[PDB]
Write an enzyme that holds these catalytic residues in place. Structure first.
Site, PDB file in Angstrom:
ATOM      1  N   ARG A  87      -6.888   1.051  11.387  1.00  0.00           N
ATOM      2  CA  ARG A  87      -7.195  -0.056  11.799  1.00  0.00           C
ATOM      3  C   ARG A  87      -7.250  -1.493  12.320  1.00  0.00           C
ATOM      4  O   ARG A  87      -7.649  -2.460  12.371  1.00  0.00           O
ATOM      5  CB  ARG A  87      -5.378  -0.365  11.695  1.00  0.00           C
ATOM      6  N   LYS A 114       0.665  -1.133   0.268  1.00  0.00           N
ATOM      7  CA  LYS A 114      -0.379  -0.490   0.029  1.00  0.00           C
ATOM      8  C   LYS A 114       0.994   1.755  -0.036  1.00  0.00           C
ATOM      9  O   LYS A 114       0.138   2.068  -0.710  1.00  0.00           O
ATOM     10  CB  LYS A 114      -0.796   0.650   1.224  1.00  0.00           C
ATOM     11  N   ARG A 149      12.894  -5.783   1.757  1.00  0.00           N
ATOM     12  CA  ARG A 149      12.414  -4.740   2.650  1.00  0.00           C
ATOM     13  C   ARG A 149      14.101  -3.936   2.681  1.00  0.00           C
ATOM     14  O   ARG A 149      14.496  -4.832   3.537  1.00  0.00           O
ATOM     15  CB  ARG A 149      10.999  -5.000   3.383  1.00  0.00           C
ATOM     16  N   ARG A 162      15.244  -2.494   8.578  1.00  0.00           N
ATOM     17  CA  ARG A 162      14.074  -2.761  10.188  1.00  0.00           C
ATOM     18  C   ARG A 162      13.923  -4.036  10.746  1.00  0.00           C
ATOM     19  O   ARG A 162      13.822  -4.769  10.512  1.00  0.00           O
ATOM     20  CB  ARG A 162      12.605  -2.324  10.374  1.00  0.00           C
ATOM     21  N   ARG A 217       2.290  -9.021  13.450  1.00  0.00           N
ATOM     22  CA  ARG A 217       1.356  -7.933  12.808  1.00  0.00           C
ATOM     23  C   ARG A 217       0.567  -8.199  12.043  1.00  0.00           C
ATOM     24  O   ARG A 217      -0.491  -8.157  11.726  1.00  0.00           O
ATOM     25  CB  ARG A 217       2.830  -7.426  11.885  1.00  0.00           C
TER      26      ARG A 217
HETATM   27  N1  LIG Z   1       3.623  -4.549  -6.055  1.00  0.00           N
HETATM   28  C1  LIG Z   1       4.446  -4.902  -5.437  1.00  0.00           C
HETATM   29  N2  LIG Z   1       5.221  -6.038  -5.749  1.00  0.00           N
HETATM   30  C2  LIG Z   1       6.079  -6.644  -4.702  1.00  0.00           C
HETATM   31  N3  LIG Z   1       6.846  -5.921  -3.896  1.00  0.00           N
HETATM   32  C3  LIG Z   1       6.510  -4.883  -3.956  1.00  0.00           C
HETATM   33  C4  LIG Z   1       5.261  -4.404  -4.168  1.00  0.00           C
HETATM   34  N4  LIG Z   1       4.677  -3.294  -3.356  1.00  0.00           N
HETATM   35  C5  LIG Z   1       5.758  -3.288  -3.081  1.00  0.00           C
HETATM   36  N5  LIG Z   1       6.709  -3.720  -2.372  1.00  0.00           N
HETATM   37  C6  LIG Z   1       7.606  -3.988  -1.543  1.00  0.00           C
HETATM   38  O1  LIG Z   1       6.541  -5.350  -0.600  1.00  0.00           O
HETATM   39  C7  LIG Z   1       7.220  -3.809   0.667  1.00  0.00           C
HETATM   40  C8  LIG Z   1       6.305  -3.478   1.849  1.00  0.00           C
HETATM   41  O2  LIG Z   1       6.062  -2.545   1.138  1.00  0.00           O
HETATM   42  P1  LIG Z   1       5.586  -0.823   1.586  1.00  0.00           P
HETATM   43  O3  LIG Z   1       6.330   0.396   0.728  1.00  0.00           O
HETATM   44  O4  LIG Z   1       6.354  -1.352   2.850  1.00  0.00           O
HETATM   45  O5  LIG Z   1       3.392  -0.300   2.180  1.00  0.00           O
HETATM   46  P2  LIG Z   1       3.235  -1.839   3.115  1.00  0.00           P
HETATM   47  O6  LIG Z   1       3.491  -3.052   2.666  1.00  0.00           O
HETATM   48  O7  LIG Z   1       1.925  -1.266   3.041  1.00  0.00           O
HETATM   49  O8  LIG Z   1       3.720  -1.485   4.642  1.00  0.00           O
HETATM   50  P3  LIG Z   1       2.977  -2.094   5.666  1.00  0.00           P
HETATM   51  O9  LIG Z   1       1.812  -2.374   5.505  1.00  0.00           O
HETATM   52  O10 LIG Z   1       4.824  -2.068   6.700  1.00  0.00           O
HETATM   53  O11 LIG Z   1       2.884  -0.701   6.567  1.00  0.00           O
HETATM   54  P4  LIG Z   1       4.121   0.789   7.512  1.00  0.00           P
HETATM   55  O12 LIG Z   1       5.046  -0.752   7.761  1.00  0.00           O
HETATM   56  O13 LIG Z   1       3.702   1.985   7.350  1.00  0.00           O
HETATM   57  O14 LIG Z   1       3.286   0.019   9.337  1.00  0.00           O
HETATM   58  P5  LIG Z   1       3.452  -0.931  10.040  1.00  0.00           P
HETATM   59  O15 LIG Z   1       1.971  -1.797   9.620  1.00  0.00           O
HETATM   60  O16 LIG Z   1       4.275  -1.370  10.102  1.00  0.00           O
HETATM   61  O17 LIG Z   1       2.778  -0.108  11.404  1.00  0.00           O
HETATM   62  C9  LIG Z   1       4.607  -0.237  12.084  1.00  0.00           C
HETATM   63  C10 LIG Z   1       3.346  -0.048  13.766  1.00  0.00           C
HETATM   64  O18 LIG Z   1       2.703   0.744  13.986  1.00  0.00           O
HETATM   65  C11 LIG Z   1       1.710   0.698  14.809  1.00  0.00           C
HETATM   66  N6  LIG Z   1       0.909   1.478  14.009  1.00  0.00           N
HETATM   67  C12 LIG Z   1       0.637   1.620  13.205  1.00  0.00           C
HETATM   68  N7  LIG Z   1      -0.390   2.011  12.536  1.00  0.00           N
HETATM   69  C13 LIG Z   1      -1.169   1.623  13.760  1.00  0.00           C
HETATM   70  C14 LIG Z   1      -2.501   1.496  13.458  1.00  0.00           C
HETATM   71  N8  LIG Z   1      -3.406   2.099  12.978  1.00  0.00           N
HETATM   72  N9  LIG Z   1      -3.200   1.429  15.122  1.00  0.00           N
HETATM   73  C15 LIG Z   1      -2.186   1.130  15.557  1.00  0.00           C
HETATM   74  N10 LIG Z   1      -1.461   1.106  15.792  1.00  0.00           N
HETATM   75  C16 LIG Z   1      -1.201   1.255  14.284  1.00  0.00           C
HETATM   76  C17 LIG Z   1       1.908  -0.774  15.351  1.00  0.00           C
HETATM   77  O19 LIG Z   1       2.084  -0.993  15.798  1.00  0.00           O
HETATM   78  C18 LIG Z   1       2.720  -1.498  13.887  1.00  0.00           C
HETATM   79  O20 LIG Z   1       2.309  -2.993  13.910  1.00  0.00           O
HETATM   80  C19 LIG Z   1       8.306  -3.266   0.473  1.00  0.00           C
HETATM   81  O21 LIG Z   1       9.868  -3.838   0.059  1.00  0.00           O
HETATM   82  C20 LIG Z   1       8.157  -2.609  -1.786  1.00  0.00           C
HETATM   83  O22 LIG Z   1       9.368  -2.407  -2.110  1.00  0.00           O
END
Ligand SMILES: Nc1ncnc2c1ncn2[C@@H]1O[C@H](COP(=O)(O)OP(=O)(O)OP(=O)(O)OP(=O)(O)OP(=O)(O)OC[C@H]2O[C@@H](n3cnc4c(N)ncnc43)[C@H](O)[C@@H]2O)[C@@H](O)[C@H]1O
Ligand SMILES: Nc1ncnc2c1ncn2[C@@H]1O[C@H](COP(=O)(O)OP(=O)(O)OP(=O)(O)OP(=O)(O)OP(=O)(O)OC[C@H]2O[C@@H](n3cnc4c(N)ncnc43)[C@H](O)[C@@H]2O)[C@@H](O)[C@H]1O
Lengths: 214, 214
Positions: free
Chosen positions: A88, A13, A123, A156, A167
């Site tokens: 979320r 995303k 990543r 990370r 997660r």
């Molecule tokens: N089409 C494609 N094909 C192949 N590869 C591709 C691709 N597109 C992309 N890729 C690759 O795939 C990888 C992923 O893409 P990436 O660019 O990292 O995007 P993503 O997958 O959406 O990222 P995350 O879901 O990990 O989001 P985040 O880290 O901002 O939030 P998180 O949940 O960790 O948040 C961290 C923590 O924060 C807290 N937190 C965050 N938000 C909330 C909330 N709303 N409520 C409560 N706690 C929260 C929690 O503790 C949570 O665990 C990259 O290597 C990219 O290059």
């Protein structure tokens, strides 16, 4: 324009958020980027959130809702915004709806759990900016280096397979129900809902999103 | 080369930092020096920090983290730097980790709590140059005078038995935990960790450090 991006942690995303931000000239509100920014700054929220995030658990709804409500009330969000990683939980979604906030589009990115576990191994991030890359599917122009600053990329500590799996468990239990939540909102005429296959290459997902948003 | 100096109050980190800067060609980043510089300028930061420092207490994490971020972005830090008095809390250390700021060496100065009040009470300084002396353990060539300028030496307000004892307590609760923090980082292969005997003469400690840094 207001948009919500829905999807499993690791579905890609955030990679598509930049394309959407430039299209409508709207800011990205990523709760993950905002919480990591709090840790990097040494804020009280950063102190409170670090241990929770390292455990792969969701931060309390009240803390995240207050952080997002403050961010949305800022000047650069008055003409629209992209929510990326929020809401979320059902309480986070109900908090926005009760407050009277409706969005124009809810876009779901579908990617299976095992593909995410395999994908996150590659990543690499520019920790200071939040720019994200993948050694194979979205590589930096120079191996190990950020395209903008030329600074060394990092892995990370939270991307250890064990924390990726924690997660994904939280996601299926607390976040997956938002698919039905916003599908219902769309049927009530409160937003448009569309799903993209996030397994496709970055360019293909971008084009699919371009066809949905025109 | 990036180095962190850890140590109890008055252990001699600042004294050794000068030799590592002159020898390895990397800038000394002293959070104390940067805060005192704000006081000398009459900046808003200097206005807020003066009484906290004079009471021997720690300045807020957010403020010091920001000071360090601004300083290490400068071009003189491209090929490395020495952090002298930073980090001093786990939130400051976690801020560095989240930002991808890796270090090559963490050097801990080991001095018994019994020697601290004596190390600080005897401290005398030449503020304009940063030259530091001890009335008994490292005296000036002329009592009360700077060796190079002949200007009168001064005594920091915090260098009094009352404050120093309160410093060693805040040290045990907030700063001592960084020993285990970086020992664990080094056990994970993220940095080299070395303990130094800080009770030895200044020249002996300098020798011990040259052997470690190469
Ligand atoms: N089409 C494609 N094909 C192949 N590869 C591709 C691709 N597109 C992309 N890729 C690759 O795939 C990888 C992923 O893409 P990436 O660019 O990292 O995007 P993503 O997958 O959406 O990222 P995350 O879901 O990990 O989001 P985040 O880290 O901002 O939030 P998180 O949940 O960790 O948040 C961290 C923590 O924060 C807290 N937190 C965050 N938000 C909330 C909330 N709303 N409520 C409560 N706690 C929260 C929690 O503790 C949570 O665990 C990259 O290597 C990219 O290059
Ligand atoms: N990260 C941070 N977060 C929050 N707040 C922060 C912060 N950083 C700074 N601050 C704030 O700023 C204040 C000032 O910080 P700072 O300017 O660092 O002062 P300090 O903390 O009182 O000094 P240290 O405890 O670090 O002493 P040292 O180990 O450097 O010993 P020294 O070389 O002087 O030597 C001591 C004496 O012993 C003598 N001596 C040195 N080596 C030897 C030796 N081998 N044998 C005998 N005598 C020796 C010296 O001549 C001298 O007289 C802090 O108290 C705090 O308020």
């Amino acid at each position: 324009m207001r948009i919500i991006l829905l999807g499993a942690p690791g579905a890609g995303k955030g990679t598509q958020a930049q394309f959407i931000m430039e299209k409508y000239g709207i800011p990205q509100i990523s709760t993950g980027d905002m919480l990591r920014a709090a840790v990097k700054s040494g804020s009280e929220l950063g102190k409170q959130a670090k241990d929770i995030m390292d455990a792969g658990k969701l931060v309390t709804d009240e803390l995240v809702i207050a952080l997002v409500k403050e961010r949305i009330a800022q000047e650069d969000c008055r003409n629209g915004f992209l929510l990326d990683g929020f809401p979320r939980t059902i309480p986070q979604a109900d908090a926005m709806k009760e407050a009277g906030i409706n969005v124009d589009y809810v876009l779901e990115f579908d990617v299976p759990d095992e593909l995410i576990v395999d994908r996150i191994v590659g990543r690499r991030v520019h920790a200071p900016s939040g720019r994200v890359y993948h050694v194979k599917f979205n590589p930096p122009k120079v191996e190990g280096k950020d395209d903008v600053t030329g600074e060394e990329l990092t892995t990370r500590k939270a991307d250890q397979e064990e924390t990726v799996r924690k997660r994904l468990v939280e996601y299926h239990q607390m976040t997956a129900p938002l698919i039905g939540y916003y599908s219902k909102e769309a049927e009530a005429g409160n937003t448009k809902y569309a799903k993209v296959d996030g397994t496709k290459p970055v360019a293909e997902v971008r084009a699919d999103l371009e066809k949905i948003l025109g």
